[PDB]
Structures are given as structure tokens and as C-alpha cells.
Coordinates of C-alpha atoms in Angstrom, one line a residue:
Chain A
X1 CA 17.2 -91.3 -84.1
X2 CA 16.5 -88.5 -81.6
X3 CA 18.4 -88.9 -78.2
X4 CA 19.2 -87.2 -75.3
X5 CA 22.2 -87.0 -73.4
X6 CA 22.4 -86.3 -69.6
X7 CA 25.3 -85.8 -67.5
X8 CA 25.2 -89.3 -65.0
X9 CA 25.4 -87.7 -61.5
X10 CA 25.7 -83.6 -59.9
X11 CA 26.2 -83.1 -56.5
X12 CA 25.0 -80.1 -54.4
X13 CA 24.6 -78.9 -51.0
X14 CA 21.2 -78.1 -49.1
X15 CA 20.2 -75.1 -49.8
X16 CA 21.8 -74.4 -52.9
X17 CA 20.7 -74.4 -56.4
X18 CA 21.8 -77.0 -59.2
X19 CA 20.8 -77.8 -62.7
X20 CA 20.7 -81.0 -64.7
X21 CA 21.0 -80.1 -68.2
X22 CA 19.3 -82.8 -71.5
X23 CA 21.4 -82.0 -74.5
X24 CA 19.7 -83.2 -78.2
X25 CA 21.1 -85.6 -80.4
X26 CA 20.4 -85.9 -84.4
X27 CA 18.0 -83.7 -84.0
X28 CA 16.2 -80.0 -82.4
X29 CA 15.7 -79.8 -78.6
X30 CA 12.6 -77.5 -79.6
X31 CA 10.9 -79.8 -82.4
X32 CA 8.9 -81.7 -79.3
X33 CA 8.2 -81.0 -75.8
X34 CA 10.6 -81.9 -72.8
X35 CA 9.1 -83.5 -69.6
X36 CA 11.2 -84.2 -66.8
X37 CA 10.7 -87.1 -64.5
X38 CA 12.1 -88.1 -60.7
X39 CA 12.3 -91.2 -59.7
X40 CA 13.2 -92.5 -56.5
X41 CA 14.7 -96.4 -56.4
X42 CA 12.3 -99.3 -57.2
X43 CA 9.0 -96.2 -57.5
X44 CA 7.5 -95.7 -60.5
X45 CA 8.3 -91.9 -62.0
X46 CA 6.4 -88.6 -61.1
X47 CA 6.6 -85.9 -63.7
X48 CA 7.8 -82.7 -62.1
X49 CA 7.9 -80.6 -65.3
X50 CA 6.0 -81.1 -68.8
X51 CA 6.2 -79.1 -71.9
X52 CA 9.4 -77.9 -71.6
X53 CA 8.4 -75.9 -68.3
X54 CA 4.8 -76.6 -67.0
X55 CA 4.8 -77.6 -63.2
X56 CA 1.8 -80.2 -62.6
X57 CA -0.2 -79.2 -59.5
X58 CA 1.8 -80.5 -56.4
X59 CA 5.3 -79.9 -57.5
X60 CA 6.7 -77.2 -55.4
X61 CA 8.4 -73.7 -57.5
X62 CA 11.5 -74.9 -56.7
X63 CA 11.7 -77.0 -59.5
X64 CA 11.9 -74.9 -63.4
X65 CA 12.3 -76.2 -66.6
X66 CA 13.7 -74.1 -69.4
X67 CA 14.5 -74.8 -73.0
X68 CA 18.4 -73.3 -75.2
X69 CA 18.1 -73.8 -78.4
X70 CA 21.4 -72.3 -78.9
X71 CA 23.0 -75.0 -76.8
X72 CA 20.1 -77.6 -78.0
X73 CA 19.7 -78.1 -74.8
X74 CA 17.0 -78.5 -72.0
X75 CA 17.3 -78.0 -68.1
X76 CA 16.1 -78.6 -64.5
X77 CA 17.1 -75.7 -62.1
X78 CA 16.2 -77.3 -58.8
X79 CA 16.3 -74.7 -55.8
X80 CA 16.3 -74.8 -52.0
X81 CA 17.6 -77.9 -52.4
X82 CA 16.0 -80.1 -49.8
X83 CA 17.8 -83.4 -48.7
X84 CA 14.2 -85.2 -50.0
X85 CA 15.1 -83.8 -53.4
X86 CA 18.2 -86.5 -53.5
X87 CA 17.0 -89.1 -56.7
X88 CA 17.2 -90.2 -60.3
X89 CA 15.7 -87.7 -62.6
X90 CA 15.2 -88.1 -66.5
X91 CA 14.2 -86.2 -69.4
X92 CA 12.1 -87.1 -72.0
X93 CA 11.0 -86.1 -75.4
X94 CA 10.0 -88.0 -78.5
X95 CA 11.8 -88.2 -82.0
X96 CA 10.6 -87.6 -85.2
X97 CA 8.4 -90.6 -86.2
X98 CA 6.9 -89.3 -82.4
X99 CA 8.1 -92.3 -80.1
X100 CA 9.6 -91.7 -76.8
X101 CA 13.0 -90.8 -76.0
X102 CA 14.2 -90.8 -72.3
X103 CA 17.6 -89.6 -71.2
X104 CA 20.0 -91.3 -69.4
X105 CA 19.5 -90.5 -66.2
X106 CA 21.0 -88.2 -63.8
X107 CA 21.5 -88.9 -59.6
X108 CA 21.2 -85.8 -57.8
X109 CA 22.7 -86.2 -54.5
X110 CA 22.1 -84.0 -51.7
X111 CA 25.0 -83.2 -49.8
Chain B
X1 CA -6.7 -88.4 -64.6
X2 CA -6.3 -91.0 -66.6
X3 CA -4.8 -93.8 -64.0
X4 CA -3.0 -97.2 -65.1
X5 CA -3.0 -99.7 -62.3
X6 CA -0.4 -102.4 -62.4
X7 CA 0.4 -105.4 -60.1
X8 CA 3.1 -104.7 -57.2
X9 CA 5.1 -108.3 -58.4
X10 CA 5.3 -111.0 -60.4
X11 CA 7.3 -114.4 -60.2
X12 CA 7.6 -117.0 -62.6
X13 CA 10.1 -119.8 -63.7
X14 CA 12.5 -120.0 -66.4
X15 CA 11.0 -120.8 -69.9
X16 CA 7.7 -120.1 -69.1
X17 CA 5.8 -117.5 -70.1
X18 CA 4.4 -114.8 -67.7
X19 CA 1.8 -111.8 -68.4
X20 CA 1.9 -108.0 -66.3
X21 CA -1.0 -106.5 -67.0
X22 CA -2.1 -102.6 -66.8
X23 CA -5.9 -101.9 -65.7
X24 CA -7.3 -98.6 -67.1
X25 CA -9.0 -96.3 -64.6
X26 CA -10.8 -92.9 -65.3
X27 CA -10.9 -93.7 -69.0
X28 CA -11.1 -96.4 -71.5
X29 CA -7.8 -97.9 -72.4
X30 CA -8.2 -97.8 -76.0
X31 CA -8.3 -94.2 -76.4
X32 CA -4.6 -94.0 -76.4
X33 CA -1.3 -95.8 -77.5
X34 CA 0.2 -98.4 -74.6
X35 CA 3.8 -98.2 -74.0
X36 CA 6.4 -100.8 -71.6
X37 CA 9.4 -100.6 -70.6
X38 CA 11.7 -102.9 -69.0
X39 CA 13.6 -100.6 -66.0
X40 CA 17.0 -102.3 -64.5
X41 CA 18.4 -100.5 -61.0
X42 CA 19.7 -97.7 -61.5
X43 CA 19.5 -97.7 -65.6
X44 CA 17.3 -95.5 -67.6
X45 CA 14.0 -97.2 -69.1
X46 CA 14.2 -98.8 -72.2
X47 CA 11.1 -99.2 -74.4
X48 CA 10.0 -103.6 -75.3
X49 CA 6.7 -102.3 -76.9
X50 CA 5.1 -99.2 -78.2
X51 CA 2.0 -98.3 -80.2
X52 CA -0.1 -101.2 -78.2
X53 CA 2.2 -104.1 -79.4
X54 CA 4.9 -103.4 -81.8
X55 CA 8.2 -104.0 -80.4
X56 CA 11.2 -101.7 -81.7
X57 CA 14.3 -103.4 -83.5
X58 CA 16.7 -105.6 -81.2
X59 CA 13.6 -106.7 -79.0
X60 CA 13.1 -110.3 -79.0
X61 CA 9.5 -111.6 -80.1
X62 CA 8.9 -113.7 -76.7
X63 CA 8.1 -109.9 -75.8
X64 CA 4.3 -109.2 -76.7
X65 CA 1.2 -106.4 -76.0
X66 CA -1.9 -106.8 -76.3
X67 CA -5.2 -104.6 -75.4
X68 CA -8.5 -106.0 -73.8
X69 CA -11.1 -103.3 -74.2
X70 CA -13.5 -105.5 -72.6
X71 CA -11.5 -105.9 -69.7
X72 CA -9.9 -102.0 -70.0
X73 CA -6.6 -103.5 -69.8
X74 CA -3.3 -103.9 -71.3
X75 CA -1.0 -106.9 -71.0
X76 CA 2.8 -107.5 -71.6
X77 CA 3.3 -110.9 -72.1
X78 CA 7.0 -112.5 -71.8
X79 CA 7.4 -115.7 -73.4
X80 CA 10.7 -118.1 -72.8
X81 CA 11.6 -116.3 -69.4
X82 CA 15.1 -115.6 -69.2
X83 CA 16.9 -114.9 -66.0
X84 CA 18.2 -111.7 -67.4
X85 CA 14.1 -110.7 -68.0
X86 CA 14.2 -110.0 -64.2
X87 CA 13.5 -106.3 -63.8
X88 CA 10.8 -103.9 -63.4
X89 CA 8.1 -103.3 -66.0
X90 CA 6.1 -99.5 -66.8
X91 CA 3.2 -99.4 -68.5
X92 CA 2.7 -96.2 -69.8
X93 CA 0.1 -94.0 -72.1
X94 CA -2.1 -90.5 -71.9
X95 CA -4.8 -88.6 -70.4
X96 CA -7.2 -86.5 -72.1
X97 CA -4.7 -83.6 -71.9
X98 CA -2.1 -85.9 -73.5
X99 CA 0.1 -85.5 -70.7
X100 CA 2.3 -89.0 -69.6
X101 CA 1.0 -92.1 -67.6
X102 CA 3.0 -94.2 -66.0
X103 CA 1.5 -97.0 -64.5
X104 CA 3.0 -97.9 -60.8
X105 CA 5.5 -100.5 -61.9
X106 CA 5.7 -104.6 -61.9
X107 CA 8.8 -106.4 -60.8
X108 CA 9.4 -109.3 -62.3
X109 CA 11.5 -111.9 -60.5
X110 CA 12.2 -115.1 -62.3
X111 CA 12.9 -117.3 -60.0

């Protein structure tokens, strides 16, 4: 009964750097991996970070992943913001029996 | 690179049963677990089947997978159309590397 919690919308000026952080439920942010997804309205979703903090070929540096187990906690650091970078983005792990657990989605928008 | 190809749209009346269907491409279909998920604007995904065809708890049973090896395919089939079934519909499964598939996305409008 895994889930992850995501603040619904952060706000930041081009430029600038913000963060959208995943925070676990009922469970350990570091028992399975964290892939984060964007998604722009109606368009199926692109990953632009896998296990925990991979980039897939194509995603510009701008965009980090990093893993707190402290805070049980995972997070995308977006930087340079760029006024294309304004969409939905998601995390995404699984739970324990290994089924998929998305976030609830967080709207970036680009000042 | 794994691909799952999707049709753009669907339309179909209410009470009558419609089928999306998600074509495997680089790879055979059946070499991994087939996931949808029905998408609303704005709202974060919510799984209708995983594992090929079982649906989790609270999904109604006019929701139903299937997989057609011969035809390297996987089908969501919605039975008893509801107006409130109008949304947008993500296959979803894994390459070689195990990394996430998403398919390009359906919408379903019942008309």
C-alpha cells in the first residue's frame, strides 16, 4: 500500500532552479527505484529520469533526480528553467507486491 | 527500444462495448507484463489492469486485457460504456533493460 505524495503545483521564474519533491507512504523511498515522468496535456509521458537518477539519452542535464532516505523522500531539481519546461510531471515507483505506484502529479509553471 | 503503438482515438456509444488495442514493435509482446491506465485531464493515471489482465480492487469487470501473441498485441476491452469511461487510455510495459513503456495514448470519447 505504497504511495507517493507530491506537492500539486510549484511555481518558478526562467532561469531559476526548482524542485518537486515525491515523499513515501507505508513504506521506504529506497526499497524500489524512482522514475520521473513529464507530461504535457493530452501527450502520452516521456521519462526524464529512471532509477532514482539515470537521465535517458536526450534529456538535457538540467534535469537531476536524487533520492533522502532521511526525509523518505525523492526529487526533481530542474535547472535553467526554460519556459518549454512548464508541464505535469509525476513520479513513479512500485510497492511491495512490485505493482506500480504513480504520484499525484505536480504542475510546474514557468513564470 | 521496445515500442507500443496505440490508436490516436476511439469513439463508441453508450452500452456498447469498445476495444483499444497496443501493437508491439521491436519485441514480442509477451515477453513482458501489459499494464492500462485510464488518464482524466489534469489527474494522475490510475491503473484498470495490470499483469496482462487482472484488474485491481474497485475496477469494475466491463474492464478486460487480453494478449494476442499472434497478432503482438494487447487489447483493453470496455464493456457497458459509461459516459464517465470517456478519458484517455496508456498502455504500458518493458524493454529489454526493463526500463518503462508507455504506449502513445487512446482517447476514448463515448459519444
Amino acid at each position: 500500500n505504497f504511495m507517493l505524495t507530491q506537492p500539486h503545483s510549484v511555481s518558478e521564474s526562467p532561469g531559476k532552479t526548482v524542485t518537486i519533491s515525491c515523499t513515501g507512504s507505508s513504506g521506504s523511498i529506497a526499497s524500489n527505484y524512482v522514475q520521473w515522468y513529464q507530461q504535457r496535456p493530452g501527450s502520452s509521458p516521456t521519462t526524464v529520469i529512471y532509477e532514482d537518477n539515470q537521465r535517458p539519452s536526450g534529456v538535457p542535464d538540467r534535469f537531476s533526480g536524487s533520492i533522502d532516505s532521511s526525509s523518505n523522500s525523492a526529487s526533481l531539481t530542474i535547472s535553467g528553467l526554460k519556459t518549454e519546461d512548464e508541464a505535469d510531471y509525476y513520479c513513479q515507483s512500485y510497492d511491495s507486491s512490485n505493482h506500480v505506484v504513480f504520484g499525484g502529479g505536480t504542475k510546474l509553471t514557468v513564470l
